[PDB]
């Protein structure tokens, strides 16, 4: 069964796509906003035919235009993720961009793009060549952003840290102690029937990215913004994946004992206030059981009262504690 809606929408976007080639960068962003709303929203069917029209604007001289293309590509992977192999090249190329503002927006978009892209690819039973190409680009995007922790721009470094946090979380296994999060995806959600990649290899990469974050967190000349961002990213990783709890608690313990001498008095107070919040959050996780006294120690150093710390510790039955108290005893031997 048919109606006029699709044809009326196609006529509207054809007009908009035609104006683009002769429009000012300011007019181009207005046009693209309207094209996205229709082609990926109101009349979603029209998305594939007007792809190249939008994707060509990734080459435009105006950075705002390039940022709008990123916003579009990010929406494509949310609503029409099947188009992922046709839009993923633009993302990788835009990470080579000259403007730091464009780089930051691309890193931001890569969070959802990589999660949606990873979810889609491991869902296919008979994946084609286009699927292997898209996964190769996604692997390169991870490596690209991983290099950006040594970028000279502080904003780029902050975005890169945030991106790497999601990768570690995706490329590890959830458990009983993991925080309940609605759209949570782990290596447990990656099927054995998947030929594109191996669960063990992604885990190996996730562990290497975490090791890099742990080392980055402990450097002497890290900026206050990068240090706060890294501390919260380590907290998200440990509460989502409590297997990493011991490592993150140790990093936090080492930081509180050795504040970078590059931090200003205000930066110290800002870093310590954030560290206190992260520690409070971790103490609420059932997986922090073994580290409860260490966490308490640090919170006392950071000015928390006995009763404030005490209220954070989750209530556990003796049968649960005995399971944990014995698991901790057998792992130490």
């Amino acid at each position: 069964m048919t109606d006029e809606k699709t044809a009326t929408a196609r006529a509207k976007v054809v007009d908009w796509c035609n104006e683009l080639v002769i429009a000012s960068p300011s007019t181009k962003c207005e046009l693209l906003a309207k094209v996205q709303e229709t082609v990926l929203g109101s009349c979603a069917e029209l998305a594939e035919e007007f792809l190249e029209s939008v994707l060509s604007l990734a080459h435009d001289s105006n950075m705002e235009v390039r940022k709008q293309v990123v916003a579009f590509v990010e929406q494509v992977c949310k609503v029409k993720v099947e188009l992922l192999p046709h839009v993923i090249n633009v993302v990788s190329m835009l990470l080579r961009d000259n403007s730091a503002q464009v780089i930051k927006r691309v890193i931001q978009a890569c969070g959802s793009i990589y999660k949606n892209g990873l979810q889609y690819l491991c869902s296919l039973m008979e994946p084609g060549d286009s699927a292997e190409q898209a996964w190769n680009i996604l692997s390169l995007i991870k490596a690209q952003i991983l290099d950006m922790i040594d970028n000279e721009n502080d904003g780029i470094r902050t975005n890169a840290i945030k991106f790497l946090e999601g990768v570690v979380v995706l490329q590890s296994f959830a458990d009983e102690d993991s925080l309940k999060r609605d759209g949570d995806f782990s290596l447990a959600d990656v099927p054995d029937h998947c030929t594109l990649f191996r669960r063990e290899k992604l885990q190996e990469e996730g562990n290497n990215i975490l090791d890099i974050l742990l080392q980055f967190h402990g450097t002497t000349h890290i900026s206050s913004v990068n240090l706060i961002a890294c501390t919260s990213s380590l907290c998200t990783i440990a509460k989502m994946r409590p297997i990493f709890m011991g490592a993150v608690v140790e990093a936090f313990k080492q930081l509180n004992a050795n504040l970078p001498p590059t931090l200003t008095d205000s930066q110290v107070s800002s870093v310590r206030k954030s560290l206190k919040m992260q520690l409070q959050t971790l103490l609420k996780n059932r997986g922090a059981f073994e580290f409860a006294s260490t966490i308490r120690g640090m919170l006392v150093d950071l000015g928390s009262s006995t009763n404030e710390i005490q209220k954070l510790i989750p209530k556990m039955d003796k049968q649960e504690m005995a399971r944990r108290q014995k698991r901790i005893l057998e792992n130490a031997a």
Binding site: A100, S112, N153, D154, V225, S266, K273, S274, M277
Partner: protein, 190 residues
């Protein structure tokens, strides 16, 4: 002047954020203001004027007018409500907004903690960072005025930057020195 989305946050969204909102809007900034409290509290010490968030500034004006028009003219509360009703419809709560900013300015450490607690309580989706800064403003008409000039001074200096992320820590560091102030600075994510 710049393309900076700024938010000023306080307890009630009545005195301190509105004094800064007014001056930043007049400087041409894309400014929004919020309160971190559960309800809107206006000034006995144990007897305050409490209103829900979303209650029109006009209705609060006509409520304190019918209560005591003379007393609420002498304490300058109706003068304050006149200014706010000209800026926007009603005071808004930060914890309920879906708006995203480049910079969030808090007027006291207690507000700062409420903003940071709230943003941390939410799973990040866009992975978009926001700078959260604290500028201590004492809750009284005279200090809310002086404070609004500091906040406007600070946002103007930051608006001048060609790369705020890469310059912000040095800018805060020199601003703190010149103005003999402590500006707490954190980064949160959307």
């Amino acid at each position: 002047p710049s393309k900076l989305a700024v938010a000023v946050v306080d307890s009630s969204n009545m005195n301190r954020s509105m004094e800064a909102h007014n001056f930043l809007a007049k400087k041409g900034f894309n400014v929004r203001s919020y309160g971190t409290g559960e309800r809107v509290k206006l000034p006995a010490f144990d007897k305050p004027n409490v209103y829900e968030f979303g209650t029109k500034y006009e209705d609060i004006y006509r409520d304190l007018e019918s209560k005591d028009k003379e007393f609420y003219t002498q304490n300058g509360l109706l003068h304050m409500l006149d200014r706010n009703r000209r800026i926007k419809k009603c005071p808004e709560r930060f914890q309920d907004t879906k708006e995203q900013f480049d910079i969030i300015v808090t007027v006291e450490e207690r507000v700062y903690d409420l903003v940071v607690m709230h943003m941390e309580s939410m799973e990040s989706v866009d992975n978009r960072p926001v700078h959260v800064l604290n500028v201590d403003v004492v809750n009284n008409a005279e200090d809310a005025l002086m404070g609004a000039f500091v906040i406007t001074d600070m946002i103007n200096m930051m608006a001048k930057s060609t790369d705020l992320d890469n310059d912000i820590d040095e800018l805060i560091q020199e601003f703190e020195e010149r103005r003999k102030r402590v500006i707490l600075h954190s980064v949160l994510f959307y």
